[PDB]
Amino acid sequence: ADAVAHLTPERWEEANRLLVRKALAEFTHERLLTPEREPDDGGGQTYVVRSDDGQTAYRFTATVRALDHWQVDAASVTRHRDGAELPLAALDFFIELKQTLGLSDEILPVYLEEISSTLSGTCYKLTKPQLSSAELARSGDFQAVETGMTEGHPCFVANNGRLGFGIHEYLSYAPETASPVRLVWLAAHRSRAAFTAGVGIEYESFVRDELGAATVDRFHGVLRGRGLDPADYLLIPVHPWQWWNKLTVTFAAEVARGHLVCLGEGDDEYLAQQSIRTFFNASHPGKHYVKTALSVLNMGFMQGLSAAYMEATPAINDWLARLIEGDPVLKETGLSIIRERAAVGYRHLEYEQATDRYSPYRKMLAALWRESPVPSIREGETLATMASLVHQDHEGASFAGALIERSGLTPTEWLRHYLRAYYVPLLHSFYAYDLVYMPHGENVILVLADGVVRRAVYKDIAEEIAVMDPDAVLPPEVSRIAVDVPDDKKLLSIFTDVFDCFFRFLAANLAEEGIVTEDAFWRTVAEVTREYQESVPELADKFERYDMFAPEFALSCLNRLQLRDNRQMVDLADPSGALQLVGTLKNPLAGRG
């Protein structure tokens, strides 16, 4: 009973209301829905969306903001059929709108699971102590912020499925539980496992730094006790779910043959971060994060980690770190990365022979270590995921709002600092190097001082960065990041991932709360843009070619990807074949060049 105590009628009702509100907003944004304006209820501002069959009506109020952003009011949402009101039920919403939303017969039931799971997660979150944005901002507690996020991805509606976790596993492993996790360590035979080190890393010292000499010794003692030579093995940390549910079954042959040997649990307590299988070391915050392979489904992908990709991983991070260090614009912004410093991959030789390069069976056992940002900060400074800037607490108060307030700066001065730290590097990376990232909430950490963004740190590099120049000259080990993207889609890396998928929400949240107008938000973005471009006149040709101030850019729809295919939302053999562009949005930078 304890495990399901969060699942009560009142919390489920609230969870449903929240999710339907989001569904209406975001599926409207994506043009799957087209709400009809009704004539004036309380001076107007009321819409209706009808079911596929027209019999059920979802009515609501909304404020429509820039980038076709629908701020659907959660308390206004009502559902009617036959003159009568019905309860708001997310499952029924998806069934009723299944043809409208483009959910096929094959996908609908699995997507309903994902929705059920997301809703369950909201119920769990509703049980947590309900901290205001102001309290969270005053805590200075990096992990209170990390584990206190509630929305998840702001676009995807089915965003917290974590399908593969039973409820007990949810409670042990989901980031919002803040449950401490001990990693399981394996010894992997060197005929199948390879460790790759970044600049300045050496394996023996590395694992001793991370585990301590005592634990390494103990692990050696496990090996010796079974008649194995430690020299023949490399250490690999695994997510306990992966061990108990996958490696001990799927990779039973490896365990049995002694290709993999279970060494026990490491001592240190870790916290799952937003990405679920990346772990922060709570016992020793200055130690590395550990990113693990986790074969659970979330937001269109299994959370596996490719063994083959590990070999290039530290080298790519070294390349990028060195590039950042060398670039005066980037220096001025204060940008840094937390490097993926070391990685270990395991090649299951028989699954390899049985599969192609894209199979999830090749992504079941690998790990990387990413440096902590904690040692880099000074006293006075605190850390927060950038996802926090779009967080709203239980009363609707923006966490960015709370930072603004604590800073004592005007909203636009506060924004300027954030934009110089986070945004300008994206501009300059694009224009100077053809370099893009995946710079969403969870892949940026903010360094804060008295509520002000002093600098931003990027993470999740090797698997996300791209150089949009198929002829790029790059060190051989990093040349796999060069890609061929049509010229007319290159700038979507900013317009989609920054503007439509992050700023859309940030600017809406701030305006709705009365803190700063969309006008001034986007003015500030424009001013920062212009000031950057004026500072690098040698790139003026490029600034003209790829116009940040163009009147429109494509609407790239995110939910549509998942609704079309919620198991492999992107074909990795053809990743740009997934993109779903549906008309254009007016650029809020238009007319501000």
Q: Which residues bind its own copies (CB under 8 A)?
A: 1, 3-4, 7-9, 11-12, 89, 91-92, 94-95, 98, 105, 108-109, 112-113, 116-117, 119-120, 123, 163, 165-168, 170, 184, 243-246, 248-253, 255-258, 262, 264-265, 350-351, 353-356, 359, 361
Residue 230 CB, shortest distance to its own copies, in Å, is 17
For residues 500 and 559, the answer to whether their CB atoms sit within 8 Å is: no
3-state helix, strand, coil in the chain (%, to 5): 45, 20, 35
How many residues make up the chain in this entry? 593
Binders of Cl ion among residues 520 to 559 (CB under 5 A) are: none
Residue 5 CB, shortest distance to its own copies, in Å, is 10
Residue 350 CB, shortest distance to its own copies, in Å, is 4
Please tell me the distance from the alpha carbon of residue 593 to that of residue 565, in angstroms, as a whole number. Answer: 39
For residues 310 and 340, the answer to whether their CB atoms sit within 8 Å is: no
Residue among 344, 353, 241 at smallest CA distance from 288: 344
Strands (E), 285-325: 289-292, 294-298, 301-303
Q: Which is nearer to Cl ion, 291 or 416 (CB)?
A: 291
273 binds, among its own copies, Cl ion, none (CB under 5 to 8 A by kind): Cl ion
Residue 340 CB, shortest distance to Cl ion, in Å, is 9
361 binds, among Cl ion, its own copies, none (CB under 5 to 8 A by kind): its own copies
Interface with Cl ion (CB under 5 A), residue from 61, 71, 172, 275: 275
For residues 435 and 472, the answer to whether their CB atoms sit within 8 Å is: no
Stretch that binds Cl ion, among 56-64, 105-113, 268-276, 514-522 (CB under 5 A): 268-276
Q: Which is nearer to its own copies, 40 or 105 (CB)?
A: 105
Q: Which is nearer to Cl ion, 248 or 274 (CB)?
A: 274
Residue 186 CB, shortest distance to its own copies, in Å, is 10
Name, in order, each residue with C-beta under 8 angstroms of 296's C-beta and a sequence gap of 6 or more: 162, 163, 164, 165, 241, 276, 302, 303
61 binds, among its own copies, Cl ion, none (CB under 5 to 8 A by kind): none
Q: Residue 48 gets which letter from DSSP? A: E
Residue 408 CB, shortest distance to its own copies, in Å, is 44
What the block records as the tokens of 77 is 């949402």
For the chain, the distance separating the N- and C-terminal CA atoms, rounded to the nearest angstrom, is 60
Q: Which is nearer to its own copies, 102 or 258 (CB)?
A: 258
275 binds, among Cl ion, its own copies, none (CB under 5 to 8 A by kind): Cl ion
336 binds, among its own copies, Cl ion, none (CB under 5 to 8 A by kind): none
Please tell me the distance from the alpha carbon of residue 565 to that of residue 547, in angstroms, as a whole number. Answer: 33
Q: Which is nearer to Cl ion, 273 or 524 (CB)?
A: 273
Classify the C-alpha dihedral 502-505-509-510 as positive or negative.
positive
Residue 277 CB, shortest distance to Cl ion, in Å, is 8
For residues 298 and 562, the answer to whether their CB atoms sit within 8 Å is: no
Q: Which is nearer to its own copies, 262 or 581 (CB)?
A: 262
Residue 83 CB, shortest distance to its own copies, in Å, is 22
Q: Containing H/E element for 425? A: helix 424-433
458, β-bridge pairs: 337, 444
Interface with Cl ion (CB under 5 A), residue from 71, 76, 248, 274: 274
Please tell me the distance from the alpha carbon of residue 161 to that of residue 407, in angstroms, as a whole number. Answer: 36
Stretch that binds Cl ion, among 42-50, 137-145, 267-275, 509-517 (CB under 5 A): 267-275
Name, in order, each residue with C-beta under 8 angstroms of 356's C-beta and a sequence gap of 6 or more: none
Note whether 273 binds Cl ion by CB under 5 A.
yes
Residue among 310, 271, 311, 275 at smallest CA distance from 296: 275
Binders of Cl ion among residues 6 to 45 (CB under 5 A) are: none
257 binds, among its own copies, Cl ion, none (CB under 5 to 8 A by kind): its own copies
Q: Which is nearer to its own copies, 205 or 353 (CB)?
A: 353
Q: Which is nearer to its own copies, 4 or 540 (CB)?
A: 4
26 binds, among Cl ion, its own copies, none (CB under 5 to 8 A by kind): none
Note whether 442 binds Cl ion by CB under 5 A.
yes
Neighbours of 322 (CB within 10 A): 12
Pairing of strands 435-436, 444-449: unpaired
378 binds, among Cl ion, its own copies, none (CB under 5 to 8 A by kind): none
Alpha helices (H) in 128-202, listed in sequence order: 133-139, 142-148, 167-173
* 3-class DSSP state of 484: coil
278 binds, among Cl ion, its own copies, none (CB under 5 to 8 A by kind): Cl ion
Note whether 278 binds Cl ion by CB under 5 A.
yes
Neighbours of 487 (CB within 10 A): 9
Q: Which is nearer to its own copies, 156 or 170 (CB)?
A: 170
Residue 432 CB, shortest distance to Cl ion, in Å, is 25
Residue 488 CB, shortest distance to its own copies, in Å, is 36
Classify the C-alpha dihedral 190-191-194-200 as positive or negative.
positive
For residues 169 and 276, the answer to whether their CB atoms sit within 8 Å is: no
Residue 249 CB, shortest distance to its own copies, in Å, is 6
Note whether 460 binds Cl ion by CB under 5 A.
yes
Q: Which is nearer to its own copies, 164 or 439 (CB)?
A: 164
Please tell me the distance from the alpha carbon of residue 287 to that of residue 268, in angstroms, as a whole number. Answer: 10
What single letter denotes the amino acid at residue 464? E
Q: Which is nearer to its own copies, 77 or 297 (CB)?
A: 297
Please tell me the distance from the alpha carbon of residue 452 to that of residue 334, in angstroms, as a whole number. Answer: 14
Residue among 301, 477, 285 at smallest CA distance from 383: 285
192 binds, among its own copies, Cl ion, none (CB under 5 to 8 A by kind): none
Residue 413 CB, shortest distance to its own copies, in Å, is 45
Residues binding Cl ion (CB under 5 A): 273-275, 278, 442, 460
